[PDB]
Symmetry: C3
Subunit: 342 residues, 3 copies
């Protein structure tokens, strides 16, 4: 909600409380999943061709006892917008791959999980320097592009050390990526994104998915008109898709597709399919499905501040030694949520 707007400076303080429960045979997923987010988006007019901005978003789990706290920063960045010349921001932000893969990340609860956070340039991550340009310098309506750099986020100590070190599955070396999207008209959009990240020496000491670079190549399509939403994304990755908590897939092929309809009375059913196919895994595993499910659900929007939903992950992965070793869930989940937001 915009809570301040005075003398060229505006501040939106926003958030949500999601009273959320999962039902699953997977005891690591089953039970209370209540959480909240809080954030702000601020903007300051500097002059005719320059606006400054800042955004922060934080998640605090609501499903723990008072003896602990599970919270984290989703984004935290500052930037400048310069008219038709583009914008630049730096901080914790979304990787440019998500400029296209976000088109399928629209499910009531699940979805968006052929990749994760702190996962090279695929989604949220630290130290992104991001240049963006909408409508190609004001010359081509509907043609947008981005160019992005990510500095190394290494280990806590030793050869890969940076100030902000972390575990191998959340590290990266220096990376570069970009995206292009185009409005084809009549509700249709097409997009592509590429990223290439150096990997660190400690990442390459894990058994799975060695290589000098983590690479991703994405294409996407969407239709968004007449109360219909359709989208698909295909992403091919190299040493970039996590294999549970074991390392990465030498290669993976990720595909997500979704269809939704918004009824005027407030109901938005959703059907989707997601898969991630890993190739050439070490330890004799070879080709393995890393993710495979159908998702059926619906959100009922009471208004823009209140909603409720059901989401059903129909998990098509087989329970096998591989999935158990990797810690990949093979069970179905039903989610029920009630959401207040501002």
């Amino acid at each position: 909600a915009e809570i301040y707007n005075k003398d060229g400076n505006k501040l939106d303080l926003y958030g949500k409380v999601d009273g959320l429960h999962y039902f699953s045979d997977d005891d690591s997923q089953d039970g209370d999943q209540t959480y909240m987010r809080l954030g702000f988006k601020g903007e300051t007019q500097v002059n005719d061709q320059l606006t400054g901005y800042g955004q922060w978003e934080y998640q605090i789990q609501g499903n723990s006892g008072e003896n602990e706290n599970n919270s984290w920063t989703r984004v935290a960045f500052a930037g400048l917008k310069f008219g038709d010349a583009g914008s630049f921001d730096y901080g914790r932000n979304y990787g440019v791959v998500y400029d296209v893969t976000s088109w399928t990340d629209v499910l009531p609860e699940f979805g968006g999980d052929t990749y994760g956070s702190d996962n090279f340039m695929q989604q949220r991550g630290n130290g992104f320097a991001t240049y963006r340009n909408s409508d190609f310098f004001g010359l081509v309506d509907g043609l947008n592009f981005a160019v992005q750099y990510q500095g190394k986020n290494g280990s806590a100590s030793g050869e890969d050390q940076t100030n902000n070190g972390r575990t191998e599955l959340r590290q990266n070396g220096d990376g570069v990526g970009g995206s292009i999207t185009y409005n084809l008209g009549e509700g249709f959009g097409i997009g592509t994104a590429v990223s290439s990240s150096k990997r660190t020496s400690s990442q390459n000491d894990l058994t799975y998915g060695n290589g000098d670079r983590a690479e991703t190549y994405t294409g996407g399509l969407k239709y968004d008109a007449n109360n219909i939403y359709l989208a698909a994304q295909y992403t091919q990755t190299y040493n970039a898709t996590r294999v549970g908590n074991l390392g990465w897939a030498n290669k993976a092929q990720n595909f997500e597709v979704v269809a939704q309809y918004q009824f005027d009375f407030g109901l938005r059913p959703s059907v989707a399919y997601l898969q991630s196919k890993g190739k050439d895994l070490e330890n004799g595993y070879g080709d393995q499905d890393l993710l495979k499910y159908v998702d059926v659900g619906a959100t009922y929007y009471f208004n823009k501040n209140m909603s409720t939903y059901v989401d059903y992950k129909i998990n098509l992965l087989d329970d096998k030694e591989f999935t158990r070793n990797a810690g990949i869930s093979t069970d179905d989940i039903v989610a029920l949520g009630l959401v207040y937001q501002f």
Copy 2:
């Protein structure tokens, strides 16, 4: 404070800073106790018979150094209010037992401690689904009731596992409870509450207080008029009252009583007595006092945003092997507080 009210959506952002110091021979209590809370309460009008809401409240200790952070979520829930048909909410909230025991939880600093947080359905806890009805459907003025369910919050791994696992003393199985309060008129109120929670297998592997279910039965009475506040609550529990950090009392009898007066110039003296009597404790302990103190104090309210208080916990427990083993404090405490709130 209400900081937003527009187009049927309202947001109250509230908080407090309590500059607080304890004086005690108990070194685990003595010293700086400064803390803050922050929260919001949002409400959205959906239609003539339906309002959505969300509430979140967080505590951050202000008495640590910058190398650590001690914070936690008090509540986090979302709900719907259906005019006279009642309300429903889900998330981290107060157990319905507290609908009655809260009547004595009014001391300047101490009190409210014959039970704790994450303590079956007695106070704050995860995964409450709560139905409430005020003035009995608009048929009986002053008659309120609630019915509540709490899903299992289990262990981090193994047989009792849920996604949001925690230590035994803060676990629960599936539970159900209810409360009824009635305005007798002329300032008097009467209330009762009952709860019954399944206990988990890991809870039942501790030495103290094994059983299938944790159950509570509460009666309360109060007078709240003419600047006088008098209240008492009596609660009988089974396998539900913590014995320090060792487990639970097979049975306990808890009693709290308080008298206060509000002077028009701002001063509110308070006198109270609390005890918790544990029965049939294991390891030869038998009947033991778990809590026993007189409390004398006063709050001076400068206005609705600023107050200061003294509170004196006169601890009547004897220092003995049992209390030392259980980690129950037997020393007096004096608290001095200065509170800004909004």
Copy 3:
């Protein structure tokens, strides 16, 4: 930003996002340093001669992954201001030494580091009771003083225990200090501060800097007019200046000096020099430099809500066994920051 002002109560909710990167051969400093702060400052008019207030400020690092959270309370206090009779506040706050040493803590990124946080009464710390008077009771314009007490913040357990125990380098015993500053006119200011804190037995079990009390003596001078800022502070300490993470200096002499100029178009160059000279260190180290650098940098202010800066720490310490043992950084750092604030 002031977001509420009604019926005698006002609330300023403020914060910043600093998109920040360090370049250094010191891998513990190098890399992404993005962070945010959030805070509030509230004030309530009680009557003609009394105002209540509260302030809280929190830092949340923006340079970690989502599997961790690094955050802390900077300040959290409540107070009363009694017209010209002065103010009193209690909580986590700044020690009165900083009333003078803050005059040099004005660099774009670095600076302010001949002392740290939770470092006796030198900067931020727990449990400060602080009396302040501006303009000497309304009788002497520009003459300010303060008197401050800090209660013991001891160990987690054992002989020095307090409720809010911490590691030795962040402990203190009971302390007293004061400051006096005077506006000489025409941009000139002069100040002095003195503090004396009991040390704890666990502090005195460390090798470096044992003694009954930690003591500090500070003088400062500044010139602040005609777009020029000049300041210097000299502090002599006894058992109060940290030697890396090893303990304290039996004696230290700290000197900071800074010169800045503000151009109308928004650029503020800055040049500074800082040194901390430790004396009589144990383990044969004798006299050692603890800190020594020249700082050159500049901030460009777009407006009151947006800025960017470069800061260059030219480290003059030698890499030698002492600095490596103490964990004192001897490398240069360049910082680049982009800051949105409200």
